[PDB]
Amino acid sequence: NEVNLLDSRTVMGDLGWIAFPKNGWEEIGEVDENYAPIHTYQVCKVMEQNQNNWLLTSWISNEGASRIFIELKFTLRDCNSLPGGLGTCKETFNMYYFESDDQNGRNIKENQYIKIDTIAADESFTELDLGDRVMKLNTEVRDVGPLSKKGFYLAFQDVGACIALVSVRVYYKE
């Protein structure tokens, strides 16, 4: 019953995502047995304050569908494990979207983003070893109502959290 419009981890080639500002969100590459990279995205600017870091996915086709589900898998640091004095540390990030036919270009400045929700992290991790921190993945799913155009973009805004977006999946349910 499920049909993927986007699946960040199984993509062939580059996802073609953009960050604003250009520092901030980083794209990570992990190579598999066939040297094919799995891409994820992470940001961890908990040093200072006043973070507004954006990550725009490229145009996603709805494929005539009307209601879609965004499935997110991510990790996120325990803000308590970080020193209390250095700067901002949040445990939640935001997700927006905007519908469009205009396939792809120089974007963020003039688009109205529709806030979908504030994503919170069921489980944060500390420097309790990595490798066992895929164990600390949490999953959050959200669906968005009646679509107009022939496609949409998803936008993630970080305001000072320590997160790894390990999977982003969009799909309609026919």
UniProtKB/Swiss-Prot annotation:
Localization per Swiss-Prot or TrEMBL: Cell membrane; Cell projection, Axon; Cell projection, Dendrite
* Modification after translation (UniProt): Phosphorylated. Phosphorylation is stimulated by the ligand EFNA5. Dephosphorylation upon stimulation by glucose, inhibits EPHA5 forward signaling and results in insulin secretion.
Q: Which residues form a coiled coil?
A: none
Q: In which tissues is it expressed?
A: Almost exclusively expressed in the nervous system in cortical neurons, cerebellar Purkinje cells and pyramidal neurons within the cortex and hippocampus. Display an increasing gradient of expression from the forebrain to hindbrain and spinal cord.
Which stretches make up the Eph LBD domain?
2-174
Its subunit composition reads:
Heterotetramer upon binding of the ligand. The heterotetramer is composed of an ephrin dimer and a receptor dimer. Oligomerization is probably required to induce biological responses. Interacts (via SAM domain) with SAMD5 (via SAM domain).
Q: What does this protein do?
A: Receptor tyrosine kinase which binds promiscuously GPI-anchored ephrin-A family ligands residing on adjacent cells, leading to contact-dependent bidirectional signaling into neighboring cells. The signaling pathway downstream of the receptor is referred to as forward signaling while the signaling pathway downstream of the ephrin ligand is referred to as reverse signaling. Among GPI-anchored ephrin-A ligands, EFNA5 most probably constitutes the cognate/functional ligand for EPHA5.
State the similarity comment: Belongs to the protein kinase superfamily. Tyr protein kinase family. Ephrin receptor subfamily.
Instruction: Supply the name of the protein.
Output: Ephrin type-A receptor 5
Q: What is the originating organism of this protein?
A: Homo sapiens (Human)
Organism lineage string = Eukaryota, Metazoa, Chordata, Craniata, Vertebrata
